[PDB]
Amino acid sequence: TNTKGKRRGTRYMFSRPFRKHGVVPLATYMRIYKKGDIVDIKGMGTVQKGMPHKCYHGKTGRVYNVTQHAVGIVVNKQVKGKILAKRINVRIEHIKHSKSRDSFLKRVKENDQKKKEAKEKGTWVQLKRQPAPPREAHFVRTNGKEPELLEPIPYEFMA
Amino acid sequence: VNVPKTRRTFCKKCGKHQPHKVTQYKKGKDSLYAQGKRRYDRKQSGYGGQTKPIFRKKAKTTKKIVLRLECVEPNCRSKRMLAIKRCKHFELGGDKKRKGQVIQF
């Protein structure tokens, strides 16, 4: 019984944030998108041209094509029991760079620097990051103070 | 809707934008020697009654209006069919509208 309209249920999805209406800031247009970089599809509603469909809002994809005003993005879409890679043309107002890739690139650059330093000197270093290990043994000083005795409080009917 | 009797638009034969005279396309009469009409007449001859469906279930109230364009260049009388959306009332070259006017009593 649900309509198949392209923008059904997007009432808050494409609405602007509070006190952030009006002119689109120009750094969004000044961003540079190459082929192969990773972008988050947001989908603001001030620009009605080149809008992504609501199923791609909040998704992340890789740029494969660059045009005058838009980019082509290869974004995964799960359709029932299969995930298929869809190519979508999105104007640059509705996308932004993804920092998930950038954090990994920083880690790679630091890893290569550390490996070069280790090979230069001769000291081995742990390169793989590890899950949070169990806390080691330590001493807790009382500083000449008895720890404060805590007790549950009596019940009272506030209102 | 109201469309003007002339418009400047692309001419396929001229290969460029040219002035065009605009009329309304009207369906021509049936040939009686078109192959489908011949087949229908042969099928209907004899006994058996009606042999093809007769629609009689109309639902649309309008038609898509087709404009017959004609290039006005004397060496190029090339014609074209432009279809516009469905309209109940269509006028060719009617009087244009004005904004700052009163409603007549």
Binding site: N65, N76, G81, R87 | -
Partner: protein, 61 residues
């Protein structure tokens, strides 16, 4: 007379019985759908890429 209209019950189990496989990623993604002007210039660059082979080999040497 009347029947059940729609459900997605058991559909998730059906989808996961053979696994929800991601698309098969591989090197050299296809060039279809890319800007025709950029694509025809890439074809020209590939065609004329042969010339300068001597310069490239000398620099490599």
């Amino acid at each position: 007379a009347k029947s059940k209209n729609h459900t997605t019950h058991n559909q998730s189990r059906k989808w996961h019985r053979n696994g929800i496989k991601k698309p098969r990623s591989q090197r050299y993604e296809s060039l279809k759908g890319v800007d025709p002007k950029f694509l025809r210039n890439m074809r020209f660059a590939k065609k004329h890429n042969k010339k300068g082979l001597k310069k490239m080999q000398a620099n490599n040497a």
